[PDB]
Design a protein around this ligand. Structure first.
Ligand SMILES: NS(=O)(=O)c1nc2ccccc2s1
Ligand SMILES: [Zn+2]
Length: 258
């Protein structure tokens, strides 16, 4: 893999190594709020993070991942559009170089400053690597970030970023509670899609919350001090690590709310 978000290896190039990039259920997408139909058959989302066990935070060269112990049913997502039980494995964000861009999904073409992805795998497939090979293998909970008041529950994340500045660096990151990153409402849109980074597998049920969380300018500024590069290499700030909206094609976005 040599893909990224730079001037020569960005999303518009990914199809050359990952031809599924031009596939029929790629993500992210623009959510046209007027066209998304309310589906009264959709259940409330069940987010059960009470026993979530974070372990580590890693700069992987494209984002930072907060990783969870997913060796048993601790932090799970169920309900909503989902059949069965999906286990939290990691979360990460996508963000911009300025507050006017950064999200992957858009809402009536609005870009948010960032987007949080909580990634979960369907336990019926036994492990993450097998789940990503299935059309219903993953459920990603997407949450928009806007800049305003600080998010207190995010500060522990931002304060560790200086210790994982460059690609390949990790730090212990235990006892982090991802419930502190959720908005008040769990109203959502949902559609079938894909991973938004290579290999872009078409294995994701997307659940995108309508209500953004607010973070402070200072918090997002610290995201933007991370580096895509490794230690000692020329500094490339980790910014604009988002894939743009992809064609909706033959898909319906459903709303959980009127
Ligand atoms: N950015 S994301 O769609 O949340 C996501 N991307 C990837 C890439 C590989 C494996 C899992 C995921 S989950
Ligand atoms: Zn993501």
């Amino acid at each position: 893999h040599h893909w990224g978000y730079g001037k020569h290896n960005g999303p518009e190039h990914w199809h050359k190594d990952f031809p599924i990039a031009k596939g029929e259920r790629q993500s992210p997408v623009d959510i046209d709020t007027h066209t998304a139909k309310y589906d009264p058959s959709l259940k409330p989302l069940s987010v059960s993070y009470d026993q979530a066990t974070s372990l580590r935070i890693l700069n992987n060269g494209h984002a930072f991942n907060v990783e969870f112990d997913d060796s048993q049913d601790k932090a799970v997502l169920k309900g909503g559009p989902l059949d069965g039980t999906y286990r939290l494995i990691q979360f990460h964000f996508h963000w911009g170089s300025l507050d006017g861009q950064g999200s992957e999904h858009t809402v009536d073409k609005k870009k948010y400053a960032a987007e949080l992805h909580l990634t979960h795998w369907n336990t019926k497939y036994g492990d993450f690597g097998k789940a990503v090979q299935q059309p219903d293998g993953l459920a990603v909970l997407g949450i928009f970030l806007k800049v305003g008041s600080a998010k207190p529950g995010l500060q522990k994340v931002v304060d560790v970023l200086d210790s994982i500045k460059t690609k390949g660096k990790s730090a212990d990151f235990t006892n982090f509670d991802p419930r502190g990153l959720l908005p008040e409402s769990l109203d959502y849109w949902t559609y079938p899609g894909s991973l938004t980074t290579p290999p872009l597998l078409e294995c994701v049920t997307w659940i995108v919350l309508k209500e953004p969380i607010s973070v402070s300018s200072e918090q997002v500024l610290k995201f933007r001090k991370l580096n895509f590069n490794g230690e000692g290499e020329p500094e490339e700030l980790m910014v604009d690590n988002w894939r743009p909206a992809q064609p909706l094609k033959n898909r319906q976005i459903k709303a959980s709310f009127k």
